[PDB]
Design an enzyme around this catalytic site. Structure first.
Site, PDB file in Angstrom:
ATOM      1  CG  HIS A   1       4.340 -10.420  17.752  1.00  8.42           C
ATOM      2  ND1 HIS A   1       4.705 -11.847  16.824  1.00  8.42           N
ATOM      3  CD2 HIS A   1       3.635 -10.405  19.029  1.00  8.42           C
ATOM      4  CE1 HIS A   1       5.812 -11.903  17.608  1.00  8.42           C
ATOM      5  NE2 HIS A   1       5.152 -11.942  19.058  1.00  8.42           N
TER       6      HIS A   1
ATOM      7  CB  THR B   1      -1.100   0.086   1.307  1.00  4.11           C
ATOM      8  OG1 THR B   1      -1.835   0.974   1.501  1.00  4.11           O
ATOM      9  CG2 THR B   1      -0.055  -0.065   2.621  1.00  4.11           C
TER      10      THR B   1
END
Lengths: 226, 217, 224
Positions: free
Chosen positions: C196, C144
């Site tokens: 994570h 992006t």
């Protein structure tokens, strides 16, 4: 892992949690050159002081820039109520001020109609009322946006948390002298990091970034504001 | 298509059960780096262990903890002891060896124990050493990380993230001088720790670290 | 006169929320020196001999592919861990109805010009509302770019069921320390947000450092 326990600030705890749990909060950062404003403030300040009785500070410029930005990005001034997006035709800005019982969000109403001095006076008024515990619930209810300043604490940069049911929040920070690149030449300027946390369910990338860029622009050319 | 279970849950709940925010700052590593070159070799011989940065961080963190009990607290259980979890990397991922009563340890002691734990982690000899800790110091500088957002390790309230030391042009006395700067990142649970406090905590660390001859006193 | 007009993306609202609620999302930042790439841009020649213009995006995609090949977890996905043998990269492009994620397929097999052309193709299709659902389905990673908007630095949000997302930003001239000497370089901040639960510290940081490296030496990216 528990040596001493004090019983419970539990409501606010719930608010903050739900604040972070009910919104897709993200943060976009930027930097602004405080040199220009500082110059205006240098030359026109004392005059302004006498002719208006109040002292010309930075906060008024921020509020003014924020109002301008709000007028260009209605979504940022909007709110999301469960399945609807409530837009606002008025500009009420919550201004985080610190009291011995923690920070408080005194609302500055219709700031779009207030002039420099007026904003400077009201901000003062609220600051004192907060110190004396004279801040009314009326003063603490409302606001479509929030301006929080951690620069007073020496904060370089941070991630502000949205104050529901508001959509975004702007975080001012410490003004530090920083070597910068101006015209292929390096000059030290009083830079400041802006941090805008926004609820992504309503406000998107181009908009939050646009909003923040707008503030930077207006602030870097106060004449085009004041 | 084509072709960490409990940990995944822990991390998720970690981020879902706390109002986690991050406050950043920068510290000038020049001073510490100077003592290190001036007294390092001496320290090495007279103490057998090598003088590194980590000891200074732990020491500064302890000092900071003593000034901001909420940061050493847990959700509200306050702690009278200073146990600091120190993230170290093992082939099976990072581990949180706890350094106990670091307030009572001297420079060399911290330097030795940190080493001890680092090796035990390499050899898989780290004992369930892994229980406790009121705070956590994580260093991603070893990986080349410039700046990042550390995640809180429940039931702890905050976590400090060390990063890479890069030479950066800075403004010192209206003059621009290159200094070995480092970004500090403190993620804290806002339900317990507020703005002024996290920022204060971090500013304290910056201060002590920029003047080691004050930390030791 | 003073009214709260409630206007009756709610799905997207749910997606974003669950995106942030179902993943342990963290962000690691870094900076890259755009000077080298800007120097290649060798551009006019490329333009004529390839018909398309040589921009930055191709270099990013190429670097990202390289990085993906070294960190399979980053190219993986967590289904309630699915690794991918292919390299499909979602590329956020802006349409008047918001951003869209056109997928660039098998970018590991595309050459500079090809990537430059397809990126263009998708950009236009997005402008004309001709972007098919086929074009919008898939992708193991997402690139992006908010630099187009003037964004200095930010925290990208992961697009499920992807594991990470890279955020490009504005290229600003910045005084930097090169050889104990201060020189102004066109710096850019990279932001990688990662889940994570799958990707850890050393890996996200490694992934990002890899991108920085390759990008700072494109003559190790022109042909692999």
């Amino acid at each position: 892992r528990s040596e001493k326990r004090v019983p419970m600030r539990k409501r606010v705890a719930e608010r903050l949690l739900e604040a972070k749990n009910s919104t897709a909060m993200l943060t976009t950062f930027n930097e602004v050159n405080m040199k220009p404003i500082m110059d205006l403030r240098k030359q026109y300040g004392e005059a302004f002081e006498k002719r208006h009785g109040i002292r010309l500070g930075f906060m008024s410029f921020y509020v003014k820039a924020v109002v301008e930005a709000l007028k260009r990005y209605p979504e940022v001034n909007a709110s999301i109520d469960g399945d609807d997006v409530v837009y606002h035709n008025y500009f009420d800005v919550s201004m985080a001020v610190s009291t011995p019982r923690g920070l408080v969000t005194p609302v500055l109403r219709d700031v779009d109609t207030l002039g420099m001095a007026d904003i400077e006076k009201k901000i003062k008024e609220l600051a004192v009322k907060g110190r004396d515990g004279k801040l009314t619930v009326e003063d603490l209810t409302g606001g479509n946006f929030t301006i929080t300043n951690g620069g007073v604490f020496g904060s370089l940069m941070s991630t502000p948390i949205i104050n529901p049911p508001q959509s975004a929040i702007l975080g001012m920070h410490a003004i530090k002298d920083r070597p910068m690149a101006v015209n292929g030449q390096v000059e030290i300027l009083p830079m400041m990091y802006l941090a805008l946390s926004y609820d992504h369910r309503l406000i998107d990338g181009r908009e939050s970034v646009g909003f923040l860029v707008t503030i930077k622009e207006l602030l870097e050319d106060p004449t085009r504001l004041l």
